[PDB]
Design a protein around this nucleic acid. Structure first.
Lengths: 41, 62, 185, 132
RNA sequence: ACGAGACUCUGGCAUGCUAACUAGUUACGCGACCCCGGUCGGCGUAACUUCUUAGAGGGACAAGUGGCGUUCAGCCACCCGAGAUUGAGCAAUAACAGGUCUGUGAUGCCCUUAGAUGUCCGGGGCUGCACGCGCGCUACACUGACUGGCUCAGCGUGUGCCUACCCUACGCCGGCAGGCGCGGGUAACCCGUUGAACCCCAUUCGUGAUGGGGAUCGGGGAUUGCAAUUAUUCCCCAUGAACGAGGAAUUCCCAGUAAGUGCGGGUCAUAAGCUUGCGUUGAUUAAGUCCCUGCCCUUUGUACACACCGCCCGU
C-alpha cells in the first residue's frame, strides 16, 4: 500500500515525494501609474 | 639520408585494431607549407613535435 | 634561497635538453626544480598532468617494482641519491645532465602496431615513459642475485645509456624495436 | 554529463511563467527567489532548478521562447498584429495585366478599365526545369 | 504509471555558527633538572573552542569567461575556489521447474514410529591416500636476511537472563609459553595517549641452495577441557625437504586505486593460512577502440519456437 500524503502525518508521511515541487500560486497584483501616498495619522 | 621533425597542427581521431594509433595532421619544419597525415603510437596533445625516421610514407586516412 | 634551489646538493641550471622535440615533456627546470623528488602526488588525476612531474620523481616512482618493493618511495629516493653521488665521481658531470641525455638517447623514435603489422611514429610522451621504464628495468635485473648493489647498477645503466655505449639493457631494447619496426615499414 | 531531467525543467519553466519580473541573471540572488515561490524538499534539486531558472532567464532577453508566455512578448506580438498601415499594396495605381487577362476581363463588365497596363507578351514558351 | 534520475548514508571544509572535569587548548601559581633562558603525556586553575566529539544551517549550480553547437539540448577548456565526475545503498516489467524441505513450532504428500527413521549416553568418522582439479599462505633472497637503536595509526569489542567463556593495568617468580596477588571498567571515565607492523638509522652476512626457504621430524614444559591419541593451540632445542621467477593457459585492476605491511570484528572452553572492516607506504600505464568476449538500440534475412547446445541431408 502506497500511503497518501498530509502535511501533519495522521494518514501517512509528513515529507512529500522528493521529486514533488509545489510552486505556490500568486495573487492578482494591483499596480498604478499615478503615485499614491498612503499616510494615515 | 635525413632524420626530420614535424609539429602536430590538428588531431584526426584514433585508428588501429584495439584503438591505439592516433591519426594526426603534422606540419614539416623545412617547409611550413608541406603537410602529411601520420599514425602515432602513444598519448598526443595538439601542438607537440614528432621525429619522422622516413619523411616519405603518408598513412591511409578515413 | 633566491640564488638557486639546489637538488639536495645538485645543480638546477646548465642542464640543457639538447633535443628540440622532448623539451616540453622533460621537467628538470625553472618551475619544477625542487629540493627532493618526493611530491604530494596528484599528477595522475588528468591526462597530460603526468608530463609536468619532475623526472627525478618519475625515475623515483619507476624504480619501486615487483611486489616486495611496492610503495617504498623512501628507499628509492635514497637509491637515486646514492646513484647520483656515484655518477659525479665516475663521469665528471652533473648527474641531471647525464640523466637528461640518458632519457633522450633511450626513447624509441618509431614502433610497430597491428592495424597487418605496420610501422608507426612514437609520441614524445611515450618516448620519455619508455626511456625511463627501460632504464629502471635494466638497473632492476642487473642487481638481481649479484654483489653489485642497485645504485651501482643504476649509475652504470645511466652512464652507458648517456654514451650510447651499447652495453645498456635500454639501448639494446631500443635498437631492437627500431630495427623490428623498420622490418615492416 | 550534466543534463537536467524533465522534473527540473517543467518546475523551472512554470517558476518563470508566474514569477518572471522577480528574476535576474546571477544564480545566488534568484536561488533565494526560488525559496518562497517553490516548495522544494531538496537543496540539490533547489540549486539545480535555480541554476536552470537563470539559464532560461538569460535566453529570454535574446528573443523568443519554447512556450513560457512572458507578458511583454504579448504586448509586442499584439502590436505586430493590431497593425494599421497607410495606403499600401492593395491600394495601387498601376496593375500590370497579362495579354489574355485583359480579354478575360473583357468577358466581364470590366473590359476597358481605368488604371491597368497591358504587359507585352513573354515570347520563348519556356517554364519547365530541364530533366536529369 | 514504473525503472534512470531526484532520494538516504558516507568523505572532503567552516579561525563563522552552537556547546563541553567522560575532549582539549592557551595563559597562570607551583615542582623538577637546566648554562637571563629550553623541555616536561609532572601537580593544580581563569578564560577560550584552533585541535576533538555531533548538532543546526550554509556551500556547488556547468554558475563566470572563451570556443563549438543551425540550436535549443548540450560538449570542451580556463578563472575562482574545500570539492568543477568521491564511494555505497535502494533498485522496474517479464522470467529460470536455478539454490534452500539440513534456519524455522512455514510446509502438502509419501515413508517411519517401541523391529525406530523418535530421544540421550560410550566409542569412531567427516582429516582416511597410487591420483586429478579450484581458492589461498610462505617463498625462491643483497631493493635482501639477522641483531640492536629510533617515531607515528584508525575502524571496533568487553563482565553476556541461558551465558561460566569479559577486557585487562600494576608488582613479584619463571629462559619461555605461563603462574601468583592486587586493582580499574557495563566504558570520550579503564585496558589506552590503543608506544601496531612496514618504512627509517646503525651492525654483521657475501652469490654459496648461504645466516635464502622452514616443510617433515625427535625430545621435553604449561594452558583450555570431564577427555587431546589420528599429535587443540602455544614455548624451547635439535632435524634443515622441494624451490634459481614458474609450460600451454589464465585472473583482478585506472587514484589515496593496484601492491606491500600490520591491526580489529565474526567463528571462539581452545582459535585465522578464512571472511568482513580499518589505517599505513604508495605506484606504472590509459582518457581510447570494437580487434577478441559480451551487452543495448535500428534495419535486414530465416525451413529456428524445449528458440543455434536450433533444424536437417545422404551413403
Amino acid at each position: 500500500i502506497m500511503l497518501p500524503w498530509d502535511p501533519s502525518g495522521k494518514i501517512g508521511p509528513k515529507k512529500p515525494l522528493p521529486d514533488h515541487v509545489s510552486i505556490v500560486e500568486p495573487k492578482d497584483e494591483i499596480l498604478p501609474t499615478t503615485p499614491i501616498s498612503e499616510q494615515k495619522g | 639520408q635525413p632524420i626530420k621533425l614535424a609539429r602536430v597542427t590538428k588531431v584526426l581521431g584514433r585508428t588501429g585494431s584495439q584503438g591505439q594509433c592516433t591519426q594526426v595532421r603534422v606540419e614539416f619544419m623545412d617547409d611550413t607549407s608541406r603537410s602529411i597525415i601520420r599514425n602515432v603510437k602513444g598519448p598526443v596533445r595538439e601542438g607537440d613535435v614528432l621525429t619522422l625516421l622516413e619523411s616519405e610514407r603518408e598513412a591511409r586516412r578515413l | 634561497t633566491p640564488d638557486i634551489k639546489l637538488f639536495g646538493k645538485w645543480s638546477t641550471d646548465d642542464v640543457q635538453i639538447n633535443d628540440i622535440s622532448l623539451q616540453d615533456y622533460i621537467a628538470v627546470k625553472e618551475k619544477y626544480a625542487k629540493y627532493l623528488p618526493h611530491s604530494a602526488g596528484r599528477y595522475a588525476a588528468k591526462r597530460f598532468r603526468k608530463a609536468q612531474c619532475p623526472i627525478v620523481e618519475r625515475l623515483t616512482n619507476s624504480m619501486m617494482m615487483h611486489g616486495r618493493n611496492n610503495g617504498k618511495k623512501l628507499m628509492t629516493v635514497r637509491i637515486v641519491k646514492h646513484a647520483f653521488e656515484i655518477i659525479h665521481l665516475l663521469t665528471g658531470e652533473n648527474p641531471l645532465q647525464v640523466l637528461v641525455n640518458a632519457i633522450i638517447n633511450s626513447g624509441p623514435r618509431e614502433d610497430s602496431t597491428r592495424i597487418r603489422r605496420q610501422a608507426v611514429d612514437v609520441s614524445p610522451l611515450r618516448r620519455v615513459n619508455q626511456a625511463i621504464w627501460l632504464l629502471c628495468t635494466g638497473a632492476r635485473e642487473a642487481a638481481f642475485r649479484n654483489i653489485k648493489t642497485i645504485a651501482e647498477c643504476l649509475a652504470d645503466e645511466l652512464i652507458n645509456a648517456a654514451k650510447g655505449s651499447s652495453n645498456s639493457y635500454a639501448i639494446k631494447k631500443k635498437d631492437e624495436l627500431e630495427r623490428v619496426a623498420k622490418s615492416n615499414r | 554529463g550534466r543534463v537536467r531531467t524533465k522534473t527540473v525543467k517543467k518546475a523551472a519553466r512554470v517558476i518563470i511563467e508566474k514569477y518572471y519580473t522577480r528574476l535576474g541573471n546571477d544564480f545566488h540572488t534568484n536561488k533565494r527567489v526560488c525559496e518562497e515561490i517553490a516548495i522544494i524538499p531538496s537543496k540539490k534539486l533547489r540549486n539545480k532548478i535555480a541554476g536552470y531558472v537563470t539559464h532560461l532567464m538569460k535566453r529570454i532577453q535574446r528573443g523568443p521562447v519554447r512556450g513560457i508566455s512572458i507578458k511583454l512578448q504579448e504586448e509586442e506580438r499584439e502590436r505586430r498584429d493590431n497593425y494599421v498601415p497607410e495606403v499600401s499594396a492593395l491600394d495601387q495605381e498601376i496593375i500590370e495585366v497579362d495579354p489574355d487577362t485583359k480579354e478575360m476581363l473583357k468577358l466581364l463588365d470590366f473590359g476597358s478599365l481605368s488604371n491597368l497596363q497591358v504587359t507585352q507578351p513573354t515570347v520563348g514558351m519556356n517554364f519547365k526545369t530541364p530533366r536529369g
